């Protein structure tokens, strides 16, 4: 499983650039791909998505029409089309894997990304953007949502992400109750539906980074501001 | 004739009574049993739906002959249900042709029919059959209308009759030949395909060959009057003796009763000899 | 989201329909016989630890699947119930006039089986040259094994091949009658036996199986297309 | 040599099964009835579950 | 030696029969005459699982109680979401013919078997894609009939060569082999403690085998026809068997003989799938007359009938919490009853 | 447990008469089709004759057609087989076998790989 993106750099506001995400190893056909942008000194934001087999296609409110996303299974490459880059269009773009079923862990793998520069919906608010905490002692991260994410089926669509400095975000806990694949069991999550809290039993130097909260109950998938841990 | 009117009324009501039950069974037996949801069963379900829609016009059609005095519905309603009836008739004939073609494919080249037995092809062909039936029934709107003799009461004398514009113009050619092709082509196709099927079967098979022969005979007997009476009625407009008009009237009544008999028989003649259908009904 | 799960289910529906077209258009065959039967040679006659052997061959644009279960326990009363969806069962009979009685017993068991009562069986009397030479030698006491052969005579409707000895044809038709009596003992008529003659070297076996499968599918169409 | 070995193995296995202890059928029936009564009210099939809290419908 | 070999065999058989007869004091029917009957029960088909191509032979229920795996001889293994009817996976099989399928308690692995004499292990949590072939458990000389999972690494397979084998996934080799049966083994079931399991063979005998010791402890020869399906009582001590003789018999590991038989004069068709409800009262047996009959374990009464299938109900399974029963038949559809 | 205890046999002169009886127990005799299978020295097992549940349908192999007759008595659950006109080729051991499933006409008793529902059998020897 490896995701690498090509294309980018500096583009004029009226210029066009072809963003490509090539898939290797894993089956591209059965895995959906999201686009998530990371603008400097701020949080994440969803861009676009295509379902499996070039099916359902969704776009964020900011990028409807202006940006179109395409999928092409046989060459295992994901294409993102830039038509006009605005001032806010510069960000770190990430290629994100996703598959949806019971026991699935979508958004588990995130691509390295490429640099692009230019010459109601659910919103997340966090308790504090910076939490200076020493290694070893427990860490508690909390987030809020506009309305309860507890779907009538009986699960909450809350996704937690950890972004190490200079590394792609890594999924910690999906659905607020199930740990991801390969993540240590030290992470834990809880929530009453409207307020959510993430608890870590022990914090090490390798677990430092920015914590992001996500919802999948209803599009668009808006991310949190981002809580950073300082040691 | 009063005895003739009583006889035709009794025959029509008996045919309606038997056909309603037959069509209801043919409809809500396939939709409930998935084990028999095949191509032919779908065709017969469409046949039953078309026959049921045809029989729904009995309260309106029968009054035209039983009493002929009352008329309350508007011209638009008459055109609408007449178009529905003509579309259903054309759809039924085209489904006769489609079943004949499918049986010929399944007999002459049984394995070549295996690769084209997909439900999607059946849905596409039934959709195009219904669409072409609707298109062919389209000229009914400009054909039939409410008209009355000049200088009389426009209330009692109003009757839904084909417009004089069609008679005076060239639309009589459309009335004769555009409807005849939907009879000449299906009869030839049915005869040739069933003859080839019987030849391949014989070259018990005798029982089913006789059954298809009876099916073709009934098809011809119930559809030849339905067009020859139409031809005489088209010719009846031209000046001539009243003998041709009387013969056309009698032939039209015979075509009516024979067509309704065939419509009532279709959910029966195509199901009695089917052992799988005869067992799954229980 | 459950909508993505529904989309995945629809994609699985599409794939299942796509390969169900292939599954319906293809035909499955079951190969059965005995140790002395020439089933191993019949497989080698078809050209384009495991308990079941799958053979691929296509004739006239249609492909066939033959399954050979030779590498299995002889207690076959259980796994035979898995072959109901098979279009036809190809039976190989050794004409060594004695494993013939075992062949008739197996044919009776297959024909009278509740699950196999809707499956037509194809019978291939392999190694016909061995039977012909054995009956030409005259040392075989075919009357002793089957007393019915003493009084049975060749029917007037028989069609012997050119250059075939009359006693060879008489023995062949006696074997055919012995199998046909078991075939028609039930009298249901749902499935029909197809006696045939074949040898170790016979390139027309594929054509014969094609014709038998064609007839079986024709009967199935009569059963299922309101044509029987 | 195979038949005698198989017969001896079968006899040894049968004798080994002969020395096991057995408990009266009445006690077994009592235990089955006790397990019945213990889980009688926790069986959705035995006692239908209302559709309001039913995870299926 | 031979004559006294049969002499000793017959003497031991007679001794065990006499011990079993003396061990019987009151039948299950007599002691349960005072219990309250379950009465007539009606369960509707909540979900119908369309999508399979060929006839369906086996199915299994996961510990999550709503994900089930269905095995059909079309060459596909399908995981169905019972609550929402969507298909989680569609596993293409190397061999079309399959006679069994197993769902691991952890849900990470799914297994199957058939005429290939090979148990195919498939994983579901793999990040490389949807499903990949873990490894083949070749080594059996008979067709596999039933497979169940003890752990993520231990699996027991029943094959049509009178052998029951316990396989280790990590090593891929037969850890232990059991050859006590004389006929083709058709089914095996695991007790909740995963310490004992019974396998039914085509010899009217059900044998209790030890997963660790490897020795056969008890043999129940109360049947008169080939046993097709075998499954434990939820207590883990008793079990029932369904055979072709149209009768279902319940056996307990303490008494070492039959406790109660389930039969009716109107049934002349065998049983191929059997399961218990969580309380154990509702014994579900899949018969050959195109329907499933509900049998009272303690009363042998016809509580209900499941006549929603138009073909043989080859397989039947009950959720680990008993919420619903998914019955798979040869019509390529699974009907879930609640 | 199914118990098919074959009885009768022993040494008999060629051309004589012999009878074999089987004590069926552990099952309903009338609901299963019954048959006889013989094993000759140096030869494989072969089917001899079978009798239906009610005895209406009876078939014999060509080797002993007419000479041998098979009868069943559902009242006492016993199967009988009378032998006439013995020949040296008839020396073998005969196993009384039963069909696996009830209410069926299938025959799977030809198998010799330790069939479950056949008895130990009795050896019959013919010699002058």
C-alpha span between B172 and E305 (Å, rounded): 65
Q: Is E82 helix (H, G, I), strand (E, B) or coil?
A: coil
Residues of chain E positioned with their CB less than 8 A from the CB of C75 = 160, 183-184, 202
Chain B residue at shortest CA distance from E48: B34
State the residue for tokens 């508007």.
Answer: B74
Q: Which residues contact A44 (CB under 8 A, 6 or more apart)?
A: A36, A37, A38, A161, A169, A212, A214, A223, A224, A226
Residues of chain B positioned with their CB less than 8 A from the CB of E332 = none
Residues A40-55 as b/e (b if ≥16 CB within 10 A, e otherwise) read: eeebbbbbbbbbbbee
C-alpha span between E109 and E87 (Å, rounded): 17
Which among E221, E222, E225 is the nearest to F101, CB-wise?
E225
Where do breaks (C to N over 2.5 Å) occur in chain C, by preceding residue number?
A: 48, 97
Which among C108, C114, C147 is the nearest to F107, CB-wise?
C108
Chain D residue at shortest CA distance from E23: D24
Residues of chain F positioned with their CB less than 8 A from the CB of E182 = 114, 116
Angstrom distances, CA of residue A203 to CA of A136, A138, A199, A207:
5, 7, 10, 6
Contact (CB<8Å) F1/E183: no
Contact (CB<8Å) C9/E95: no
Q: Considering only CA atoms, which of A223, A141, A157, A161 is closest in space to residue A193?
A: A157
C-alpha span between E326 and E280 (Å, rounded): 17
C-alpha span between E174 and E187 (Å, rounded): 18
C-alpha span between D56 and D48 (Å, rounded): 12
C-alpha span between F115 and F111 (Å, rounded): 7
Angstrom distances, CA of residue B163 to CA of A29, B151, E238:
62, 17, 86
Which runs of E-coded beta strand occur in F57-127? Answer: 58-60, 69-73, 78-83, 92-98, 122-126
Length of chain C measured in residues: 228
Q: Which of F48, F68, F108, F115 to mutate to test the interface with C (most CBs of C within 10 A)?
A: F108
Q: What is the DSSP letter of E140?
A: -
Structure tokens at D26: 């009445």
Count of pairs with CB atoms under 8 A, one residue in B, one in E: 5
Phi, psi of F105 (to 5 degrees): -105, 10
Q: Report, in this order, helix, strand and coil percent for chain B, each rounded to 5.
A: 75, 5, 20
Is the domain spanning F3-126 CATH 3.30.413.10? The answer is: no
Residues of chain B positioned with their CB less than 8 A from the CB of E51 = none
Length of chain D measured in residues: 57
Angstrom distances, CA of residue E63 to CA of C42, E28, E68, E232, F118:
48, 32, 9, 16, 42
Cβ atoms of B9 and B41 within 8 Å: the answer is no
Q: Considering only CA atoms, which of E234, E223, E305 is closest in space to residue E261?
A: E223
Cβ neighbours of F8 (radius 10 Å): 15
Cβ atoms of B190 and B181 within 8 Å: the answer is no
Residues of chain E positioned with their CB less than 8 A from the CB of D27 = 254
Q: Which residues contact C194 (CB under 8 A, 6 or more apart)?
A: C120, C121, C122, C123, C212, C215
Q: Which residues contact B73 (CB under 8 A, 6 or more apart)?
A: B60
Chains meeting E at 3+ CB pairs closer than 8 A?
A, B, C, D, F
Structure tokens at B15: 């045919």
C-alpha span between B124 and A1 (Å, rounded): 42
Name E206's bridge partners.
Answer: E200, E220
Listed by start position, the domains of chain D span 1-57
Which among E86, E118, E138 is the nearest to C6, CB-wise?
E86
C-alpha span between C77 and C75 (Å, rounded): 6
Note the Cα D3 to chain centre separation in Å.
Answer: 34
Q: Does the beta carbon of C18 lie under 8 angstroms from any beta carbon of chain B?
A: no
Question: How far D50 CA lies from chain E's nearest CA (Å)?
Answer: 11
Q: Is E196 helix (H, G, I), strand (E, B) or coil?
A: strand
The experimental method, as deposited, was: cryo-EM
∠ CA B125-B130-B131, rounded to 5°: 95
Residues of chain C positioned with their CB less than 8 A from the CB of B275 = 223, 228
Q: Considering only CA atoms, which of E308, E313, E85 is closest in space to residue D56?
A: E85
Cβ atoms of E262 and E249 within 8 Å: the answer is yes
Q: Element (H or E) spanning E337, and its range? A: strand E334-337
C-alpha span between E25 and E38 (Å, rounded): 25
Q: What is the DSSP letter of E330?
A: T
Name A163's bridge partners.
Answer: A210
Contact (CB<8Å) E331/B33: no
Q: Considering only CA atoms, which of E231, E216, E248, E184 is closest in space to residue E325?
A: E231
Torsion angle of alpha carbons C145, C146, C150, C152, nearest 10°? -150
Phi, psi of A28 (to 5 degrees): -70, -30
Name E296's bridge partners.
Answer: E282
C-alpha span between B218 and C65 (Å, rounded): 44
List alpha helices for chain D, DSSP H.
2-18, 25-38
Phi, psi of E299 (to 5 degrees): -135, -15
Angle between helix axes B119-136 and B75-108 (nearest 10 degrees) is 140
Cβ atoms of B113 and B202 within 8 Å: the answer is no
Q: Do chains B and A touch (3 or more CB pairs under 8 A)?
A: no
Cβ atoms of C174 and C101 within 8 Å: the answer is no
Q: Does the beta carbon of C16 lie under 8 angstroms from any beta carbon of chain B?
A: no
Contact (CB<8Å) F113/C75: yes
Cβ atoms of C74 and F113 within 8 Å: the answer is yes
Q: Considering only CA atoms, which of E50, A133, E114, E18 is closest in space to residue C13?
A: E50
Residues C5-17 as b/e (b if ≥16 CB within 10 A, e otherwise) read: bbbbbbbbeeebe
Q: Which residues contact D37 (CB under 8 A, 6 or more apart)?
A: none
Q: Is F22 helix (H, G, I), strand (E, B) or coil?
A: strand
Chain E residue at shortest CA distance from D9: E180
B182-186: which pairs have CB atoms within 8 A and are 24 or more residues apart?
B182/B90, B182/B93, B182/B94, B182/B136, B183/B93, B183/B223, B183/B224, B183/B226, B183/B227, B185/B97, B186/B93, B186/B94, B186/B96, B186/B97, B186/B223
Contact (CB<8Å) D45/E31: no
Cβ neighbours of E27 (radius 10 Å): 16
Cβ atoms of A161 and A149 within 8 Å: the answer is no
Torsion angle of alpha carbons E291, E292, E293, E294, nearest 10°? -150
State the residue for tokens 């029934």.
Answer: B137
∠ CA A174-A177-A179, rounded to 5°: 55
Torsion angle of alpha carbons A182, A183, A188, A194, nearest 10°? -90
Q: Does the beta carbon of C67 lie under 8 angstroms from any beta carbon of chain E?
A: yes
C-alpha span between E236 and B22 (Å, rounded): 56
Q: Does the beta carbon of A102 lie under 8 angstroms from any beta carbon of chain E?
A: yes
Q: Which of E279, E280, E297, E299 to mutate to test the interface with D (most CBs of D within 10 A)?
A: E279
Peptide bond into A220 cis (omega under 30): yes
Chains meeting C at 3+ CB pairs closer than 8 A?
A, B, E, F
C-alpha count within 13 angstroms, C-beta hemisphere, residue A47: 27
C-alpha count within 13 angstroms, C-beta hemisphere, residue F95: 23
Q: Does the beta carbon of C159 lie under 8 angstroms from any beta carbon of chain E?
A: no
Q: Which of E17, E245, E257, E266 to mutate to test the interface with F (most CBs of F within 10 A)?
A: E245
Q: Which residues contact B166 (CB under 8 A, 6 or more apart)?
A: B142, B143, B172, B175
Structure tokens at B66: 């039983």
Cβ atoms of E294 and E325 within 8 Å: the answer is no
C-alpha span between C11 and A54 (Å, rounded): 10
Q: Is E93 helix (H, G, I), strand (E, B) or coil?
A: coil
Q: What is the DSSP letter of A203?
A: -
Range 2-31 of D in CB contact (< 8 A) with E: 3-4, 7-8, 10-11, 13-18, 20, 22-31
Name E275's bridge partners.
Answer: E284
State the residue for tokens 């992400």.
Answer: A161
Q: Considering only CA atoms, which of B223, B214, B231 is closest in space to residue B255?
A: B223
Contact (CB<8Å) C225/B271: no
Cβ atoms of E76 and E56 within 8 Å: the answer is no
List alpha helices for chain C, DSSP H.
2-25, 39-44, 100-112, 128-137, 142-145, 148-151, 166-185, 205-224
Question: How far E37 CA lies from chain C's nearest CA (Å)?
Answer: 36
Length of chain B measured in residues: 282
In order of their start, the domains of chain E are 1-337 (2.130.10.10)
Q: Which residues contact E8 (CB under 8 A, 6 or more apart)?
A: D11, D15
């Amino acid at each position: 499983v490896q995701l690498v993106e090509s294309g980018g750099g500096l583009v004029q506001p009226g210029g066009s650039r072809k963003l490509s995400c090539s898939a290797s190893g894993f089956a591209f056909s059965s895995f959906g791909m999201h686009w998530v942008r990371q603008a400097p000194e701020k949080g994440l934001e969803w861009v676009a998505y295509i379902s499996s087999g070039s099916g359902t296609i969704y776009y964020a409110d900011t990028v409807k029409g202006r940006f179109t996303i395409s999928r092409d299974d046989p060459k295992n490459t994901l294409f993102l089309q830039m038509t006009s880059l605005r001032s806010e269009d510069t960000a770190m773009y990430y290629c994100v894997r996703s598959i949806y079923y019971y026991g699935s862990s979508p958004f588990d793998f995130w691509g390295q990304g490429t640099t692009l520069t230019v010459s109601s919906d659910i919103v997340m608010t966090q308790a504090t953007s910076s939490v200076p905490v020493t290694p070893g002692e427990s860490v508690s991260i909390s987030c809020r949502s506009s309305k309860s994410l507890l779907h009538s089926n009986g699960n909450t669509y809350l996704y937690w992400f950890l972004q190490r400095p200079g590394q792609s975000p890594q999924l910690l806990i999906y659905r607020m109750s199930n740990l991801a694949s390969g993540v240590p069991d030290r992470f834990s999550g809880s929530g009453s539906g409207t307020a959510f809290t993430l608890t870590i039993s022990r914090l090490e130097a390798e677990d430092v980074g920015v914590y992001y909260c996500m919802q999948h109950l209803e599009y668009p998938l808006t991310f949190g501001a981002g809580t950073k841990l300082e040691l | 004739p009063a005895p003739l009117l009583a006889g035709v009324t009794a025959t029509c009501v008996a045919l309606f009574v038997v056909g309603i039950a037959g069509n209801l069974l043919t409809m809500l037996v396939v939709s409930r049993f998935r084990e028999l949801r095949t191509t032919t069963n779908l065709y017969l379900s469409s046949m039953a739906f078309s026959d049921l829609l045809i029989f729904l016009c009995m309260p309106l059609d029968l009054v035209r002959l039983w009493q002929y005095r009352p008329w309350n519905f508007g011209d638009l309603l008459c055109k609408l249900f007449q178009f529905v009836s003509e579309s259903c008739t054309y759809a039924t004939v085209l489904t006769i042709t489609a079943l004949s073609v499918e049986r010929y494919f399944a007999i002459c080249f049984p394995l070549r029919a295996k690769v084209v037995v997909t439900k999607g092809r059946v849905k596409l062909v039934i959709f195009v059959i219904w669409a072409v039936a609707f298109c062919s029934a389209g000229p009914i709107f400009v054909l039939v209308g409410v008209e009355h003799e000049n200088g009389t009461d426009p209330w009692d004398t109003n009757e839904c009759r084909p417009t004089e514009f069609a008679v005076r113009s060239g639309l009589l050619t459309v009335m004769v030949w555009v409807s005849s092709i939907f009879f000449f082509l299906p009869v030839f196709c049915l005869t040739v395909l069933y003859s080839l099927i019987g030849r391949k079967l014989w070259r018990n098979h005798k029982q089913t060959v006789k059954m298809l022969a009876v099916v073709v005979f009934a098809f011809i007997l119930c559809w030849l009057p339905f067009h020859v009476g139409r031809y005489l009625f088209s010719k009846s407009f031209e000046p001539g003796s009243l003998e041709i008009a009387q013969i056309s009237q009698y032939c039209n009544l015979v075509s009516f009763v024979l067509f309704y008999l065939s419509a009532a028989i279709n959910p029966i003649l195509y199901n009695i000899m089917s052992k799988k259908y005869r067992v799954a009904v229980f | 989201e459950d909508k993505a799960a529904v989309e995945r289910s629809k994609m699985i529906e599409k794939q299942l329909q796509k390969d169900k077209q292939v599954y319906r258009r293809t035909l499955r065959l079951l190969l059965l016989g005995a140790d002395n039967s020439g089933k191993s040679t019949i497989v080698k006659q078809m050209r384009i630890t495991s308990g079941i052997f799958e053979t691929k061959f296509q004739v006239d644009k249609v492909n066939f699947h033959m399954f050979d279960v030779g590498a299995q326990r002889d207690e076959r009363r259980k796994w035979i119930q898995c072959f109901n969806d098979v279009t036809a069962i190809i039976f190989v009979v050794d004409s060594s006039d004695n494993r013939l009685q075992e062949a008739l017993n197996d044919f009776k068991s297959i024909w009278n089986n509740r699950w196999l009562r809707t499956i037509s069986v194809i019978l291939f009397l392999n190694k016909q040259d061995l039977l012909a030479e054995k009956v030409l030698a005259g040392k075989s006491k075919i009357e002793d094994y089957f007393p019915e052969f003493a009084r049975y005579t060749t029917p007037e409707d028989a069609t012997p091949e050119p250059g075939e000895d009359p006693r060879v044809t008489r023995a062949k038709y006696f074997i055919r009658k012995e199998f046909v009596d078991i075939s028609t003992a039930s009298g249901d008529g749902r499935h029909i036996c197809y006696p045939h003659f074949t040898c170790s070297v016979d390139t027309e076996n594929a054509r014969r199986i094609f014709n038998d499968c064609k007839d079986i599918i024709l009967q199935m169409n009569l059963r299922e297309y309101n044509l029987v | 040599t195979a038949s005698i070995a198989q017969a001896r193995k079968l006899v040894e296995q049968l004798k080994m099964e002969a020395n096991i202890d057995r408990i009266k059928v009445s006690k077994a029936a009592a235990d089955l009835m006790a397990y019945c009564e213990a889980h009688a009210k926790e069986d959705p099939l035995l006692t239908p579950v209302p559709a309001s809290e039913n995870p299926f419908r | 030696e031979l004559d006294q070999l049969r002499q000793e065999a017959e003497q031991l058989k007679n001794q065990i029969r006499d011990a079993r007869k003396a061990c019987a004091d009151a039948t299950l029917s007599q002691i349960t005459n005072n219990i309250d009957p379950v009465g007539r029960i009606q369960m509707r088909t909540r979900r119908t699982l369309r999508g399979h191509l060929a006839k369906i032979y086996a199915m299994h229920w996961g510990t999550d109680s709503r994900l089930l795996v269905s095995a059909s001889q079309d060459g596909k293994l399908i995981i169905w979401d019972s609550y929402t009817t969507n298909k989680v996976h569609a596993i293409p099989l190397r061999s079309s013919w399959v006679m069994t399928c197993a769902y691991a308690p952890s849900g990470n692995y799914v297994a199957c078997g058939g005429l290939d004499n090979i148990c195919s292990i498939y994983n579901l949590k793999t990040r490389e894609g949807n499903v990949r072939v873990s490894r083949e458990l070749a080594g059996h000389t008979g067709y596999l009939s039933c497979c169940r999972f003890l752990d993520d690494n231990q699996i027991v397979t029943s094959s049509g060569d009178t052998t029951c084998a316990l396989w280790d996934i990590e090593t891929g080799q037969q850890t232990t082999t059991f050859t006590g049966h004389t006929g083709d083994v058709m089914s095996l079931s695991l007790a909740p403690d995963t310490r004992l399991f019974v396998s039914g063979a085509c010899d009217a005998s059900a044998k209790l085998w030890d997963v660790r010791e490897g020795m056969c402890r008890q043999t129940f020869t109360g049947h008169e026809s080939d046993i097709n399906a075998i499954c434990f009582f939820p207590n883990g001590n008793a079990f029932a068997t369904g055979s072709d003789d149209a009768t279902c018999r319940l056996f307990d590991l303490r008494a070492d003989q039959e406790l109660m038989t389930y039969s009716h004069d109107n049934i002349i068709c065998g049983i191929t799938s059997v399961s218990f409800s969580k309380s154990g009262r509702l014994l579900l047996a899949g018969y050959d007359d195109f329907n499933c009959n509900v049998w009272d374990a303690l009363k042998a009464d016809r509580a209900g009938v499941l006549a929603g299938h138009d073909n043989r109900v080859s397989c039947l399974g009950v959720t680990d919490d008993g919420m619903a029963v998914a019955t798979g038949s040869w019509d390529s559809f699974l009907k879930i009853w609640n | 447990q199914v118990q098919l205890q074959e009885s009768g046999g022993g040494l008999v002169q060629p051309g004589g008469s012999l009878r074999l009886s089987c004590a069926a127990s552990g099952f309903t005799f009338s609901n299963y089709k019954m048959n006889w299978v013989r094993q000759a020295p140096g030869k494989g097992l072969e089917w001899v004759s079978d009798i239906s549940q009610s005895g209406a349908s009876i078939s014999y192999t060509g080797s002993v057609k007419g000479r041998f007759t098979i009868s069943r008595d559902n009242a006492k659950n016993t199967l009988y087989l009378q032998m006439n006109s013995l020949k040296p080729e008839d020396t073998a051991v005969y196993y009384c076998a039963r069909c696996p499933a009830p209410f069926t006409r299938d025959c799977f008793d030809v198998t010799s790989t330790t069939y479950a529902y056949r008895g130990q059998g009795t050896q019959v020897t013919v010699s002058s």
